[PDB]
Write an enzyme that holds these catalytic residues in place. Structure first.
Site, mmCIF file in Angstrom:
data_model
loop_
_atom_site.group_PDB
_atom_site.id
_atom_site.type_symbol
_atom_site.label_atom_id
_atom_site.label_comp_id
_atom_site.label_asym_id
_atom_site.label_seq_id
_atom_site.Cartn_x
_atom_site.Cartn_y
_atom_site.Cartn_z
ATOM 1 N N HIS A 48 -38.028 48.207 2.457
ATOM 2 C CA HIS A 48 -39.015 48.050 1.379
ATOM 3 C C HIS A 48 -39.807 46.742 1.402
ATOM 4 O O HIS A 48 -40.850 46.683 0.751
ATOM 5 C CB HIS A 48 -38.357 48.165 0.008
ATOM 6 C CG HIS A 48 -37.657 46.921 -0.436
ATOM 7 N ND1 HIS A 48 -36.332 46.671 -0.155
ATOM 8 C CD2 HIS A 48 -38.092 45.868 -1.161
ATOM 9 C CE1 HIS A 48 -35.981 45.513 -0.677
ATOM 10 N NE2 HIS A 48 -37.032 45.004 -1.292
ATOM 11 N N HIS A 94 -38.373 36.424 0.567
ATOM 12 C CA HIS A 94 -38.346 37.761 1.206
ATOM 13 C C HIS A 94 -38.233 37.574 2.720
ATOM 14 O O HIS A 94 -39.222 37.533 3.459
ATOM 15 C CB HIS A 94 -39.559 38.637 0.845
ATOM 16 C CG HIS A 94 -39.890 38.680 -0.638
ATOM 17 N ND1 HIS A 94 -40.755 37.772 -1.231
ATOM 18 C CD2 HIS A 94 -39.462 39.506 -1.629
ATOM 19 C CE1 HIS A 94 -40.844 38.046 -2.514
ATOM 20 N NE2 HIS A 94 -40.076 39.088 -2.774
#
Ligand SMILES: C[C@@H](Nc1nc2c(cnn2C2CCCC2)c(=O)[nH]1)C(=O)N1CC2(CC(F)C2)C1
Ligand SMILES: [Mg+2]
Ligand SMILES: [Zn+2]
Length: 316
Positions: A106, A66
């Site tokens: 997000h 991520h």
């Protein structure tokens, strides 16, 4: 500065996201807001869009999985979806505004240790958040702390009743990408697919959650050359937490343990019982998805079952 060529590739899920750098992904994201006309329909000052994206880029971290490139895939695949499923006939432009932005926002400030590490280690985030999706609450926070600094406020021309509507959509979308709620969401989505109704605000909200989850775990839908290195980023990150979990004596998840995981077990079950069955449901609403996305998923599947049938033998 993108080419004519790059701008036709930007709209297609075959787009090689590994070939660009932060500079160009930033210009790629900015193209998207013009191209979908949100720039025009919410009166976005173009220098606000550029600073904001630079603050969205700055607030991702260097993690194997991520990172900012992961942010790009999700929004670029959500981008591809809209053309593919002609989502502008179905969804309001505010919805388009909700899908594209939340996708970009997000995983903000994702730490590289997932949700069950924050709770087990009893970290600031899990104590801040009461063991309720500590990471996804933080993402949506950092999203709006940036948005609350005026320079980065891609929203500053939108009437307050309109902000409300976006902020609430975005919260729902970001808070749904927590994989601890996969089954509950899927189950309510098929609870409305039994007879789906596009004028229903609750049928549509579940479609946006299914949409953003799709784009968020969509790495395998991509062609093999793009998808495959993203597995090693994931495992590099997962070994990092399972490495750390053992040093401190916290429990470890078997799918994250390096004494257990091979690249193939890593993707077989995940593709077979999350990716395909989800994209199977969307295919009922948008039949074009079966051709473009289900078919890559199938092929990666057969392949990864086969790689596994190779290693099992090597272990003999
Ligand atoms: C190793 C892993 N594989 C896996 N994850 C992927 C891919 C793409 N994004 N993610 C995300 C899923 C959650 C965070 C990363 C991907 O291609 N493969 C796997 O086995 N699963 C089962 C779960 C536990 C949670 F309930 C879902 C992860
Ligand atoms: Mg996340
Ligand atoms: Zn994500």
């Amino acid at each position: 500065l993108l080419s004519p060529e790059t701008i036709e590739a930007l709209r297609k899920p075959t787009f090689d996201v590994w070939l660009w750098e932060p500079n160009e992904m930033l210009s790629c994201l900015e193209h998207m807001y013009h191209d979908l006309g949100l720039v025009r329909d919410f009166s976005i000052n173009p220098v606000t869009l550029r600073r904001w994206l630079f603050c969205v880029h700055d607030n991702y971290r260097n993690n194997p999985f991520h990172n900012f490139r992961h942010c790009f895939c999700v929004a670029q695949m959500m981008y591809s979806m809209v053309w593919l499923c002609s989502l502008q006939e179905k969804f309001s432009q505010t919805d388009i505004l909700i899908l594209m932005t939340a996708a970009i926002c997000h995983d903000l400030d994702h730490p590289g240790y997932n949700n069950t590490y924050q709770i087990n280690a009893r970290t600031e985030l899990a104590v801040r958040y009461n063991d309720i999706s500590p990471l996804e609450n933080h993402h949506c926070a950092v999203a709006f702390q940036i948005l609350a600094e005026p320079e980065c406020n891609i929203f500053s021309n939108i009437p307050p009743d309109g902000f409300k509507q976006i902020r609430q959509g975005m919260i729902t979308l970001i808070l749904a990408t927590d994989m601890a709620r996969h089954a509950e969401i899927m189950d309510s989505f098929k609870e409305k697919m039994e007879n789906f109704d596009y004028s229903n605000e609750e049928h549509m909200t579940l479609l946006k959650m299914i949409l953003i989850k799709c784009c968020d775990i969509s790495n395998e839908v991509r062609p093999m050359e793009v998808a495959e290195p993203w597995v090693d980023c994931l495992l590099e990150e997962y070994f990092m937490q399972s490495d750390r979990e053992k040093s401190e004596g916290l429990p470890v998840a078997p799918f994250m343990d390096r004494d257990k995981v091979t690249k193939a077990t890593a993707q077989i079950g995940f593709i077979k019982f999350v990716l395909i069955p989800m994209f199977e449901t969307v295919t009922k609403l948008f039949p074009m998805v079966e051709e473009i996305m289900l078919q890559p998923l199938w092929e990666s599947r057969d392949r990864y079952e086969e790689l596994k049938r190779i290693d099992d033998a090597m272990k003999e």
